[PDB]
Amino acid sequence: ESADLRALAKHLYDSYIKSFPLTKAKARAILTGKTTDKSPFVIYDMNSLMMGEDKIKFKHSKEVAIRIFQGCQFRSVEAVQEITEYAKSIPGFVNLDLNDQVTLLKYGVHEIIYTMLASLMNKDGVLISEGQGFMTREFLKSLRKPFGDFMEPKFEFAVKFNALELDDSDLAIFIAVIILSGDRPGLLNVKPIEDIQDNLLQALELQLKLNHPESSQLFAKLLQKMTDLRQIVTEHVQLLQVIKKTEHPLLQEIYKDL
Amino acid sequence: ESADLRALAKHLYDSYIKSFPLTKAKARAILTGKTTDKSPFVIYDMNSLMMGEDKIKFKHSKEVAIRIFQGCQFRSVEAVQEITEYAKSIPGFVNLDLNDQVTLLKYGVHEIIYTMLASLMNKDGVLISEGQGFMTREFLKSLRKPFGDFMEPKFEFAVKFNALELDDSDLAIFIAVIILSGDRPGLLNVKPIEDIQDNLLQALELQLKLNHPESSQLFAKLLQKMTDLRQIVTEHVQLLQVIKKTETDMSLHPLLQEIYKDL
Numbered sequence A: 001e002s003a004d005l006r007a008l009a010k011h012l013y014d015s016y017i018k019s020f021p022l023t024k025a026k027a028r029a030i031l032t033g034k035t036t037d038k039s040p041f042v043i044y045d046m047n048s049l050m051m052g053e054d055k056i057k058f059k060h061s062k063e064v065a066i067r068i069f070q071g072c073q074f075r076s077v078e079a080v081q082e083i084t085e086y087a088k089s090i091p092g093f094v095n096l097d098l099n100d101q102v103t104l105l106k107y108g109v110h111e112i113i114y115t116m117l118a119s120l121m122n123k124d125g126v127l128i129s130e131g132q133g134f135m136t137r138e139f140l141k142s143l144r145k146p147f148g149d150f151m152e153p154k155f156e157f158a159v160k161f162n163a164l165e166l167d168d169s170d171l172a173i174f175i176a177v178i179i180l181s182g183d184r185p186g187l188l189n190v191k192p193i194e195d196i197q198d199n200l201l202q203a204l205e206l207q208l209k210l211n212h213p214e215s216s217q218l219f220a221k222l223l224q225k226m227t228d229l230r231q232i233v234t235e236h237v238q239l240l241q242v243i244k245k246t247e248h249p250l251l252q253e254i255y256k257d258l
Numbered sequence B: 001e002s003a004d005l006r007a008l009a010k011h012l013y014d015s016y017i018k019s020f021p022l023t024k025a026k027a028r029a030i031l032t033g034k035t036t037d038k039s040p041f042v043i044y045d046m047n048s049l050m051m052g053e054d055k056i057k058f059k060h061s062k063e064v065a066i067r068i069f070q071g072c073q074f075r076s077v078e079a080v081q082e083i084t085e086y087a088k089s090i091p092g093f094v095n096l097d098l099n100d101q102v103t104l105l106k107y108g109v110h111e112i113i114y115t116m117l118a119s120l121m122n123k124d125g126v127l128i129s130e131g132q133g134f135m136t137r138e139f140l141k142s143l144r145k146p147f148g149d150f151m152e153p154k155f156e157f158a159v160k161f162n163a164l165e166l167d168d169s170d171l172a173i174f175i176a177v178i179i180l181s182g183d184r185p186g187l188l189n190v191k192p193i194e195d196i197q198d199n200l201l202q203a204l205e206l207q208l209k210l211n212h213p214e215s216s217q218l219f220a221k222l223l224q225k226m227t228d229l230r231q232i233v234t235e236h237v238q239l240l241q242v243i244k245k246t247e248t249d250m251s252l253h254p255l256l257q258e259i260y261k262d263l
C-alpha cells in the first residue's frame, strides 16, 4: 500500500533532517552563492589554510597534509555518530539482533559517508566544518603522496552521483537501503534485514517516481551507483593501510579503523 | 521532558551492551550459579593457577606475582579500548575539542575500570578471562610484598559499591556521567562538557528513581561513591611508581603509560 510507503518516506526524511545538521538543500545554497547571507571562507592554498584555522575554529612540526587528514578523521568520527542515530530511527532496525546492528553500521558507514560527502561537493571542492569552509579540489590535490590522492576519487564519484540530482527526501531512503544490506560479513539473522531493505526499496522506488517523474529508470541508476560506492570504499581502506606506514596512544584508540 | 531522558537512557544502555562484552548481569549469573552461564575454574594457589592456563584461555620463570600483574595489565588495556568505544557513543562527546576528549578519557578511564570491575567481584574474589576464571581475594592478597596489596582496595570498594545493587542500565548512565566530568585538570572548554553531564545527571536521576523506586536517595548515594573512586586511583598510581623502581625490567603498556602522568 503506497500510503505506508509514503508514510515511511516522510518518517525517514524527518529523522534524517533531525540527524544530519548540514542537509543537501542547505549545502546546495551555500555552494551556488544563492544564499548570500553568509559566505564560507574558501581555502585554496597554504596561506588560505593557515588563515582558515583563525576564522573556522578546529582543535589543532605537524605537517600540513597530516593535520588536514587528522581533521578528516575527526569529522569521520562525528558522522559515524550521526549515522548511528539515523539508523536507530529506521523501522525495524532496533528490533534486530544487537550484533547485527553493530555489523550493519560497521560496514555501512564508509558507504554512507561518501554518499553524503557528495552533498557537500561540486567539481571544484568540498564544504567543511558545517559549511563555514570550502576546501578547493585543487588544493586537496596539491598535497604530497599519498595525501593528494585521498579525496580525488571521492570528488570523481560525487560529480557523477550529483548528476542524478537527488534531494534530501530521496537520499534519506537511499541511506536507509545502504544500512540494511543483508550481505555484510558476519550477520546472524539476515532475514529481517532483507525484509526491511525490501520495504525500504519499495519506498525508494515510489519516491523517485513521484519526485522525479521525468527521470527514467532513476531507481536502477541509483542502485547501480552502489557499485561505485563499494569500489570507492575498497580503494579507500587500502589507502588507509598505506598511510598506516607513513605516520599518541589515546588518539590512536579514538581513531580505530572505521 | 522525561521521554527525552528515557530515550537517552535506552541509547546509552544499548551502546553499553555493544561495547562491554562481560556485563554485570552475565557476571552475576556466573557468580551465583545460574544455568544461563557456566562454571568458572577457580584459582586460589599456584597449583590451581598452573592448572588455569590448561583449563582457561590465558595468554602467558617470570615469577607468579609479575605474571598475574602483566595479565591484569593487558586486561586493563582491553578495558580502556572498550571504554573509549563506549565514550564515542555518548552524545556530544565526539563533537568536543579533541584535546578535551583525550583529557576526559585519560582521567575518566581508571575510575570506570574499578566501577565496572566491581561487577566482576564479590566478597571472595573476581572473575577473570571473560568470566572463564575466578581468582580468589585470598590468593591475590597473599602475593609478594608489593603486589599483594594491589587488589584489596578494589575489593573493599566493590563490596560497598555492589551493595547499591545497580544493574547494567544504571551503570551505563553512571559511567557516562563519570566521563563527562569537567573538573579534570587541563580541560580547554569546561562548559560544553558540563552541559552534557547535566543532561546525563538528569538521565541518571530519572533512571534511578524509575528502576529503584524504593531505594531512597540512591542518586545522591551513587554520586558520593565517586569519592571512593578518586581515592582508589591515587593509591594505584603510587603503588605503580613503586614497581617501576623495584623491577626496572618490568614493562608497562604504552596506552597505559600515557594515561599515567605525574602530577
Ligand SMILES: *c1ccc([N+](=O)[O-])cc1C(=O)Nc1ccncc1
Binding pocket: A069, A071, A072, A073, A075, A076, A079, A110, A113, A117, A240, A258
Ligand atoms: C577522512 C580521513 C579518514 C577517513 N577514514 O579513515 O574513514 C575518512 C575521512 C573523511 O572523508 N571524513 C568525512 C566524513 C564526513 N564528511 C566529510 C569528511
Ligand SMILES: *c1ccc([N+](=O)[O-])cc1C(=O)Nc1ccncc1
Binding pocket: B069, B072, B073, B075, B076, B079, B113, B117, B240, B256
Ligand atoms: C592491574 C595492574 C595495572 C593496571 N593499570 O596500570 O591500569 C590495571 C590493573 C587492573 O586491575 N586491570 C583490569 C581492568 C578491568 N578489568 C579487570 C582488570
Ligand SMILES: CCCCCCCCC(=O)O
Binding pocket: A068, A069, A071, A072, A075, A126, A127, A128, A129, A135, A151
Ligand atoms: C579540515 C576539515 C576536514 C573535513 C573533512 C572534509 C573533506 C576534506 C578533507 O580531506 O579534509
Ligand SMILES: CCCCCCCCC(=O)O
Binding pocket: B058, B068, B071, B072, B073, B075, B126, B127, B128, B129, B135, B140, B151
Ligand atoms: C590473567 C588476566 C588477569 C585478569 C585481570 C582482572 C583483574 C584482577 C586480576 O588480574 O586478578
